[PDB]
Design a protein around this ligand. Structure first.
Ligand SMILES: *C(=O)CCCCCCCCCCCCC
Length: 124
């Protein structure tokens, strides 16, 4: 959600990198969103976090299939992919939804094995 603002600035950074590849001028957010959103999130485009283990499984499936299918528009962007996914998470260490899925799913407030409410304790 709000993290969207962060995605904007980044989107601009990703475009610059590809720009140095001598590649034409295309949108990264869209090209990636549509492709990925439908890739790891084919039935749930609501969130869809960045994943290396999954994107890899679904990545090879569609990819290994598209290529083995002898395509007529064999894009080079392929080679670029995968490698970018790794270096991506790194520069993402900033504070994306990935880090949130942790603070949210595993709130620090959680007791030893109870809940954040903590019946034993009473604060107000
Ligand atoms: C809430 O709607 C914000 C979206 C939550 C997940 C997105 C977080 C960052 C997305 C990474 C994009 C870069 C690689 C595709």
């Amino acid at each position: 959600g709000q993290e969207l603002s962060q995605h904007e600035r980044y989107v601009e950074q990703l475009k610059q990198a590809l720009k140095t590849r001598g590649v034409k001028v295309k949108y990264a957010d869209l090209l990636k969103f549509f492709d990925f959103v439908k890739d790891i999130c084919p039935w749930f485009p609501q969130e869809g976090t960045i994943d290396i283990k999954r994107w890899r499984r679904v990545g090879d499936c569609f990819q290994d299939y598209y290529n083995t299918f002898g395509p007529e528009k064999v894009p080079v962007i392929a080679f670029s992919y995968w490698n970018l996914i790794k270096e991506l998470i790194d520069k993402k260490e900033v504070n994306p939804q990935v880090m949130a899925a942790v603070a949210q799913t595993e709130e620090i407030l959680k007791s030893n094995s109870q809940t954040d409410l903590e019946h034993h304790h009473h604060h107000h």
